[PDB]
Each structure stands twice: as structure tokens, then as C-alpha cells.
């Protein structure tokens, strides 16, 4: 059965391959720090989005594989939408408020490392600024976004989901009525607000398309982008059916 001569020959054998640090000369120190810091913050925000989703009335009664699925389809949409909002409220003019301690100005987002992406994240920020969305409006909207993408083969709790979704759509109406009145029916603000939601599909699809067109750019990458590659695991349909308020 097999064999090798000396004990050193064996210590030689089990000696492990060399590990790389994943350190590329080309990426500047500042680009690495910012993109590293976001990635780990992103990770933490996903954890928090799930915890949150698990607190959401209705949704939390949906079968767990539905919670999973919905979470998997919508986490980017959610997070991007909250970044829009954080930014909208920490602004006046055109920042991305990734965090309180990590706010990126307009000049930073100009650079080639930032530009393609921040176009799409600002788009959400500036639209919230355009429609002067209230917190109540946003809270309802953000929930609607969780329930915005469904698999074509059905959820396991479809009737619950449907009525859940309706409720939160009615809750959005109540949000607009809190801000407007109800001497009106608020049909245009409902069209405008829903339409922003509809567009988050695009801001997400553009963000994911960026991640694929940047993942491919890493030929030979000594520092392999599993962060930008894992983002392609949990997002890659096709089952995903986008629910649109306006076709």
C-alpha cells in the first residue's frame, strides 16, 4: 500500500502550498481601502437586512424558503435603496453616504474606480430628493422592495405573499395620505413613487452588470475577487420575475 522512504520525505509531502496575500501593485492603496471597507460593510448590511426582513410583519409568516428566496432577490435592491435614502437625508447636494464615517463626495465618485457604479447609486439618491419622499413613504417603499421580485415557479406561501404585498401597497397609500391629504386620491404621487420602485430593478440590473463587467476585467488577478464573484452566485437568473407597478 503506497509508501515513501524517509520521515523527511513525508514532512516534505504534507508541507502545504504557498499562500498569496492577494496584493496587487496596480490597485492604489486608497482604492483598495475604500473597496475593501465597502465589501465588509456590505456584508454587515446584508446580515442586518435579513434580521430586519425577519422583523417585517406578514413576510415573517411566509414559509422560510420564501423568506430566503425573497431575501436573495432583493438584498441589493434594499441596500441600494437605503443608501439612496441615507444619502438623500445627509446631503443637500450629491454625496453617497455609505455610512456616517464613510461619506464619498462628488469629486471622489468622478474617478474611474467609482464612476460607473456611483452613477446608479446617486440615481436613487437624487430621485428621493426629486420626489421629496417622507420617511413613512420610504419605510413602506423599502418593504415593497423586499416583496418586489418573485420566482416564476411560485412561492410556497403565494396567497399569504399576495395579501402581504397588497397590505403594504395599501400602507404606501396611507403614507402618501399622511403627507398629501385625502381630499385628492393622490394618484400621481402613487404613480411617481411606485415608478421609482419599478426603476430599482434597473439600478440593480446595472449594478450587477457592472459587477460582471468588472469581475471579467480581473484577468490573472493575484487578489481574486470572490466578493464580486459571490455577488454572481446569489444573483444570476431564469426564475426571477420582476413585479412591475407600471409595464
Amino acid at each position: 500500500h503506497m509508501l515513501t522512504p524517509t520521515l523527511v520525505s513525508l514532512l516534505e509531502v504534507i508541507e502545504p502550498e504557498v499562500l498569496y496575500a492577494g496584493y496587487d501593485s496596480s490597485v492604489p492603496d486608497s482604492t483598495w481601502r475604500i473597496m475593501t471597507t465597502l465589501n465588509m460593510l456590505g456584508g454587515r448590511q446584508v446580515i442586518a437586512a435579513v434580521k430586519w426582513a425577519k422583523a417585517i410583519p406578514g413576510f415573517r409568516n411566509l414559509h422560510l424558503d420564501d423568506q430566503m428566496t425573497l431575501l436573495q432577490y432583493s438584498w441589493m435592491s434594499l441596500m441600494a435603496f437605503a443608501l439612496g435614502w441615507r444619502s438623500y437625508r445627509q446631503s443637500s447636494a450629491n454625496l453617497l453616504c455609505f455610512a456616517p464615517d464613510l461619506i464619498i463626495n462628488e469629486q471622489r465618485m468622478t474617478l474611474p474606480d467609482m464612476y460607473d457604479q456611483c452613477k446608479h447609486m446617486l440615481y436613487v439618491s437624487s430621485e428621493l430628493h426629486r420626489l421629496q419622499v417622507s420617511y413613512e413613504e420610504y419605510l413602506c417603499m423599502k418593504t415593497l422592495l423586499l416583496l418586489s421580485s418573485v420566482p416564476k415557479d411560485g412561492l410556497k406561501s403565494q396567497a399569504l405573499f399576495d395579501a402581504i404585498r397588497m397590505t403594504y401597497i395599501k400602507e404606501l397609500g396611507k403614507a402618501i395620505v399622511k403627507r398629501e391629504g385625502n381630499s385628492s386620491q393622490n394618484s400621481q404621487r402613487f404613480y411617481q413613487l411606485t415608478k421609482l420602485l419599478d426603476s430599482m430593478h434597473e439600478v440593480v440590473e446595472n449594478l450587477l452588470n457592472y459587477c460582471f463587467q468588472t469581475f471579467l476585467d480581473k484577468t490573472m488577478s493575484i487578489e481574486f475577487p470572490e466578493m464580486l464573484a459571490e455577488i454572481i452566485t446569489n444573483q444570476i437568473p431564469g426564475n426571477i420575475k420582476k413585479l412591475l407597478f407600471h409595464q
Binding site: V46, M68, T233
Partner: peptide, 15 residues
């Protein structure tokens, strides 16, 4: 050490 869908799964239950 943990895929995205792994993080979501872990969060849905217990990290």
C-alpha cells in the same frame, strides 16, 4: 469562508 447565500442562510437562523 462564507458565500453570500451562506450569509443570508446563517442570518435567517443563527450566525
Amino acid at each position: 469562508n462564507l458565500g453570500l447565500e451562506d450569509i443570508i442562510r446563517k442570518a435567517l437562523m443563527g450566525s
